[PDB]
Chain A
Amino acid sequence: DIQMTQSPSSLSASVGDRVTITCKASQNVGINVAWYQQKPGKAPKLLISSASYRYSGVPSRFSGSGSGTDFTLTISSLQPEDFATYFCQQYDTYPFTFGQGTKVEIKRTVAAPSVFIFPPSDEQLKSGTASVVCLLNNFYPREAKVQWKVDNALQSGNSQESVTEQDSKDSTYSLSSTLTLSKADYEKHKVYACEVTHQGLSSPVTKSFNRGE
Chain B
Amino acid sequence: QVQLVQSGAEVKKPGESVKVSCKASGYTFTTYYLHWVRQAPGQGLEWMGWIYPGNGHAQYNEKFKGRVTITADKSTSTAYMELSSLRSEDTAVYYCARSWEGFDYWGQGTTVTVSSASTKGPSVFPLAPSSGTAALGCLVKDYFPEPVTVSWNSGALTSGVHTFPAVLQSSGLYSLSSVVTVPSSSLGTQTYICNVNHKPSNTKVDKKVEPK
Chain A positions near chain B (C-beta within 8 angstroms): 1, 34, 36, 43-46, 48-50, 53, 55, 87, 89, 91, 94-101, 114, 116, 118-121, 123-124, 127, 129, 131, 133, 135, 137, 160, 162-164, 174, 176, 178, 180, 209
Contact = CB atoms under 8 A, between A and B. Distances in A.
B139 to A, nearest CB: 6
Interface of B: 44-47, 59, 61-63, 95, 97, 100-104, 106-109, 123, 125-128, 130, 133, 135, 137, 139, 141, 162, 164-167, 169, 175-177, 179, 181
A121 B126 contact: yes
B47 A97 contact: yes
A178 B44 contact: no
Contacts of A99: 44
Contacts of A98: 44-47
B101 to A, nearest CB: 4
B141 A53 contact: no
Nearest to A174: B162
A91 B175 contact: no
A99 B127 CA distance: 40
A55 B137 contact: no
5 contacts: A91-B101, A98-B44, A99-B44, A124-B141, A162-B176
B125 A123 contact: yes
Given A124-B139, A133-B137, A43 B107 contact: yes
A178 B177 contact: yes
Contacts of A100: 44
A172 B208 CA distance: 28
The 4 lowest CB-CB distance pairs between A and B, nearest first, are A34-B102, A43-B106, A49-B102, A98-B45
Given A34-B102, A98-B44, A98-B47, A164 B162 contact: yes
B164 A164 contact: yes
B175 A95 contact: no
A120 B61 CA distance: 47
A95 B164 contact: no
B63 A95 contact: yes
A30 to B, nearest CB: 12
Given A133-B137, A160-B167, 10 more contacts: A1-B63, A36-B102, A43-B109, A55-B102, A94-B62, A95-B62, A118-B128, A124-B125, A135-B177, A174-B179
Contacts of B164: 162-164, 174, 176
Q: Name the residue among A36, A43, A96, A164 with the largest chain B CB count within 10 angstroms.
A: A43
In terms of DSSP, what is the predominant structure of the interface of chain A? strand
Contacts of B59: 94
Nearest to A122: B212
B108 A43 contact: yes
Given A55-B102, A98-B47, A176 B109 contact: no
B44 A176 contact: no
A137 B177 contact: no
Contact of B139 (A133, A164, A209): A133
A157 to B, nearest CB: 11
Contacts of A101: 44
A176 B109 CA distance: 28
B175 to A, nearest CB: 7
A91 B45 CA distance: 13
B127 A118 contact: yes
A34 B101 contact: yes
Contacts of A164: 162, 164-165
Q: Name the residue among B47, B100, B108, B181 with the largest chain A CB count within 10 angstroms.
A: B47
Contacts of A120: 125
A211 B106 CA distance: 52
A129 B166 CA distance: 18
